[PDB]
Design a protein around this nucleic acid. Structure first.
Lengths: 114, 123, 119, 56, 209
RNA sequence: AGGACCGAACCGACUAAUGUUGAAAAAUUAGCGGAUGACUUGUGGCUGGGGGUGAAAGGCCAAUCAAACCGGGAGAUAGCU
RNA sequence: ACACAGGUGGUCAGGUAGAGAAUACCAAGGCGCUUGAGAGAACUCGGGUGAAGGAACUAGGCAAAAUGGUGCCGUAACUUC
RNA sequence: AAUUCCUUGUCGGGUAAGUUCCGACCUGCACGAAUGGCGUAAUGAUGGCCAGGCUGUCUCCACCCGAGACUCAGUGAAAU
RNA sequence: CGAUGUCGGCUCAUCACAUCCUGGGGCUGAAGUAGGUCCCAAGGGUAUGGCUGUUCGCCAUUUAAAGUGGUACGCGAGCUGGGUUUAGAACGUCGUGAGACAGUUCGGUCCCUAUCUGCCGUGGGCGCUGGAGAACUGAGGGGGGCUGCUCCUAGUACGAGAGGACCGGAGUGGACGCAUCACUGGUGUUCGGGUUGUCAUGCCAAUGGCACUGCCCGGUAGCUAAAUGCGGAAGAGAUAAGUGCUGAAAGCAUCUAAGCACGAAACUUGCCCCGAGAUGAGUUCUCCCUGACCCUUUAAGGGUCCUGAAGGAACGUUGAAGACGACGACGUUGAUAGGCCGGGUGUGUAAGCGCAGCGAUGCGUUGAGCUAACCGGUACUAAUGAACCGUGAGGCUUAACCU
């Protein structure tokens, strides 16, 4: 409906960079410890995107301290300050769930040239 | 989301390698355990000369679950495996002197300040 | 419950339904008027009208798509050479259902479905 | 699974009281050919709402 | 205090600058036009009867048309009633808009719940299923026993059995009002209210404070 | 070479489900055992009831077996209903 | 006892993939199983998929799920070799 | 113990916890040497226990595909 | 004894209080925390596993608690069939033997399409006194009622210390119940793609059929829990055990005999839902009908002509409503459903052509093509002019007004 569309598009962020699955992004999230706010960086590969307007999300997967960790960010959430595509990967799928059973040499993604 | 018979990896250098949850503490008829809640575990595998032996019964706090936790904005942090940190049966303080792998913001409290201080990364 | 769902099962499996609707669509565009039961006729529209809509623009890709959904080259050829220019201005609704009573053998509510400008 | 006392014809009629059929309230008259037909269905000659929709 | 009658537009979320995502339900609350005021002198109790929305002029029957005509108000899609509190007056032709709830903090939303049709005991009353194996015979989701052997030789009234679930009035209590948008006749409540999209909702101030 | 191995026809029936006024007075589906042998099968014959036959369960002997079926003594007897 | 999801010996043996008369799809050839039409509730049958956990179910891993081919490397206790 | 009533005898292993299992002990109600005693490689749709993988078996059920169940038309039982 | 199926388990319960926890209180060999015992109180709650067929019991670890019982030691026309309890077989024992064992061990068919009562839902008919469309009142009925931990009061009162409150306030959980899909996910055989074997469209290329949706990888809407909102209350009335004030009988004493006050999750309300078939059939608002006559048994009588209203039903397109009825929207003065246009989403760079490579294949056009149930529009198709049911001023007796 028009009411829901108006309500969501008046809250959407207009500076969201364009990205695709397979890209290596670096998202800066707000961390509030005690009374002070800081910026924690989380960098990994985008393994899934869910386009739903204001309810859009994307799942980033990284290998932190030897343990695979993935986090699903809400694209229009104010906790995300900025997103930056460090490197663009070339895949032929919309959801890279197969990466969870791969480590090291078997989980490399070819760069998306041109 | 940890319940009885669940095997977990150990996130500290306390000597245990693979533990099994035998009760979810903190309430009658309780089904699952998220992060930051005590469970009673048994040790099913240990390293040769560690601080704990195979078969000891003691407490532990869960620091990573494969189901993950949810934050007030709707996000979710999922890990590749279930991991816990062994605690003393009476004081409920960590046995080891180091933490392996990341943890989350759900733990920052006076009870587990030692754990979040020793953690290599607090997501 | 089947809240906001569409599509009649018609007491057949999915492959049988797909094949039956393909055959029925071919028969309808071949003869220009056919007689079938009322639910099957109401479900037949959702398959035969997009085919005509696709057929409105003659292209190799559209013909291959129509061929994939009908498996009858004569049917595809008729659709693109006649039914497309004939219905070139219509905004959908290229069929008409006329309820025609009840079948003698099993008391099924029958109907005739025909192209709008048959005459 | 089975009865203990034979039900009466009275009980049988009471159960069958709702099994009656309902006759059609009124038929429709075609505006051109004048014959009667079921509402929203074509007439027995092939007409519907004046126009002759099916040949014979 | 009286309430208003709105329509469920759908569900969405509101982001706060603190980084909290409040899930809200969008209720479009158009103006409620009073059509009859009931008093102790004539009806033995105090209440108002309001209407909202519009209805097709060829669809409104003559009795309710005359009822609306007496009040001098255009026909709405229904008639709802609110009991009047002490010291609360309203005139007949008065229109009440969504700005009534401008400083209330919690509301009670009542609507007709979604219909699940004929629901089994397992779905309707959270009964446990029986074994899917171990020799079980045609009794995987049946309700089991319903009585005792010949001393209470009947089934007790009020037993939980399968039947029609939903499509009945349900009140959800103490929801936080997130935003009152008077400019476009909107009310955003925190949480989920009963009923499908487009249904009617009755929003009243929270009885439990 | 083999009462050898895996595995179809063929022979059998270990487990579960369905069916128990069944499609069937014992079967169907998914699995299962043997599958060149003490195997299995077609045609014809022989062994008769206190008798036969039995790698033996009192099993089988025409949907009937701690003594078949049919006719006769026979309207056995019944302090029982 | 049925126009019965059962039982019945011999002969013929095509193409592709396959070790194969297994199995899948076809040729020659023959059928769609003598009530249909709707709707898409509980519940029953035969199946498909499942977050987190992996036998905590239960008399019992019953049943499901899982392994499954060919070539090669490598293979323990015990043994009548 | 296919055998022990008392008995879940006592100790040890496995398990956080083991009336079952495995290894001993001997106080064998009431084992025992061709109505065979004790072992035994291989074999078993044999009985009991444990472990890895695997899973709706379970925590705790949810959705989907068909055949019935429900409605319409035709034929039309049964136990009691 | 012309059959009343039986131990344990699963599912589902319901009642009693001789109360396991929470609530109130007296005494204590009650300093505090924590206890012992008794009285009142059934509103709610009252574990998961190892072992055995087990009930029972022991053990591990929780919990505020892991109650005792009744209901054919509840429940097999709801499920199981391990034990026991048929036919087979063996061990120990007894008997010469056939066989037998509250001795054990292996294997061993659990049927029924619900007629009546009962219960969960959902309709048809008639009534409620002219008919109809709505919205209510509330006599009555159901649901719900559990509780932890941390912090402040306060390391205060108490205590030599160890330890550590009552009363009151705030936050966050476990289990249960209701609702929902906005978020995280599952399904999504009606959407897209990868790929193996074969067959067909003459063939290449591209597709389609079958192989569990052939095997998978994703996934729209809807439905869902594991996902997230909400709830148990506060307050009032009268009380139980209990604590009292004044006060004789009985110069004193005395909670009681007269009179007055406090007191619990129990009772009645307060919260949610059904609810005038509440035949005691209720109340309020609104709409519709203002014709002529015959007959005999003369009365709440029957009949004819004209008339057919408000409204309902039927038919059609249908729904986040639904087994079928029912309920809701719409029927040309129309967005009810299907199609169509645009958008969103899902899949992942379609086919054709060109270029590079001997070729598999890659690159460009190209984030392309296809896209169900979604969103915003659009009468192109189907929702007919009618016809049917329902009537034509509504009985009698009192009372208060009106003329």
């Amino acid at each position: 409906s028009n009411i829901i569309k108006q309500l969501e598009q008046e809250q959407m962020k207009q500076d969201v960079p364009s990205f695709r699955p397979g890209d290596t992004v670096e998202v800066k999230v707000w961390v509030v410890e005690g009374s002070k706010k800081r910026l924690q960086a989380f960098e990994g590969v985008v393994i899934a995107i869910r386009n739903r307007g204001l309810h859009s999300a994307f799942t980033v997967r990284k290998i932190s301290n030897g343990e695979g960790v993935e986090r699903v960010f809400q694209t229009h959430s104010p906790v995300v300050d900025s997103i930056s595509v460090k490197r663009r990967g070339a895949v032929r799928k919309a959801k890279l769930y197969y990466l969870r059973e791969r480590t090291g040499k078997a989980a490399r993604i070819k760069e998306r040239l041109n | 989301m940890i319940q009885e018979q669940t095997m977990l990896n150990v996130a500290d250098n306390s000597g245990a390698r693979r533990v099994m949850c035998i009760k979810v503490l903190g309430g009658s008829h309780r089904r699952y355990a998220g992060v930051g809640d005590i469970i009673k575990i048994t040790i099913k595998e240990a390293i040769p000369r560690g601080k704990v032996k195979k078969g000891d019964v003691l407490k532990a706090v869960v620091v990573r679950t494969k189901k993950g936790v949810r934050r007030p904005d709707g996000s979710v942090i999922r890990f590749d495996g279930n991991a816990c940190v062994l605690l003393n049966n009476n004081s409920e303080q960590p046995i080891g002197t180091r933490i392996f792998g990341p943890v989350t913001r759900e733990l920052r409290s006076e009870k587990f300040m030692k754990i979040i201080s020793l953690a290599p990364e607090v997501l | 419950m089947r809240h906001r769902k569409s599509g009649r099962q018609l007491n057949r499996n999915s492959s049988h339904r797909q094949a039956m609707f393909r055959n029925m669509a071919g028969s309808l565009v071949r003869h220009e008027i056919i007689k079938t039961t009322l639910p099957k006729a109401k479900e037949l529209r959702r398959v035969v009208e997009p085919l005509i809509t696709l057929a409105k623009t003659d292209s190799v890709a559209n013909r291959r798509l129509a061929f994939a959904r009908t498996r009858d080259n004569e049917i595809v050829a008729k659709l693109f050479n006649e039914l497309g220019p004939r219905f070139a201005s219509r905004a959908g609704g290229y069929t008409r259902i006329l309820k025609c009573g009840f079948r003698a053998g099993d008391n099924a509510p029958m109907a005739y479905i025909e192209l709008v400008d048959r005459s | 699974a089975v009865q203990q006392n034979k039900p009466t014809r009275s009980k049988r009629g009471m159960r069958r009281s709702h099994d009656a059929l309902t006759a059609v309230t009124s038929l429709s008259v075609d505006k051109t050919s004048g014959e009667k037909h079921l509402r929203h269905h074509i007439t027995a000659d092939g007409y519907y709402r004046g126009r002759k929709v099916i040949a014979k | 205090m009286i309430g208003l009658v709105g329509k469920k537009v759908g569900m969405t979320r509101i982001f706060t600058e603190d980084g909290v995502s409040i899930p809200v339900t969008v209720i479009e609350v158009e103006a409620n036009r009073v059509t009859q005021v009931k008093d102790l002198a004539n009806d033995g109790y105090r209440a108002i009867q309001v209407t909202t929305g519009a209805k097709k002029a060829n669809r409104v029957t003559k009795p309710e048309a005359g009822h609306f005509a007496k009040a001098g108000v255009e026909a709405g899609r229904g008639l709802w009633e609110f009991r009047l509190a002490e010291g609360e007056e309203f005139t007949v032709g008065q229109s009440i808009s969504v700005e009534l709830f401008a400083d209330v903090k919690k509301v009670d939303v009542t609507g007709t719940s979604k219909g699940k049709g004929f629901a089994g005991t397992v779905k309707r009353w959270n009964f446990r299923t029986q074994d899917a194996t171990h020799g079980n015979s045609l009794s995987h989701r049946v309700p089991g026993s319903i009585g005792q052997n010949q001393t209470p030789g009947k089934v007790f009234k009020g037993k939980k059995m399968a039947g029609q679930m939903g499509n009945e009035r349900v009140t959800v209590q103490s929801l936080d009002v997130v935003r009152v948008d008077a400019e476009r006749n909107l009310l955003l409540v925190k949480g989920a209210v009963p009923g499908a999209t487009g249904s009617d909702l009755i929003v009243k101030p929270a009885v439990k404070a």
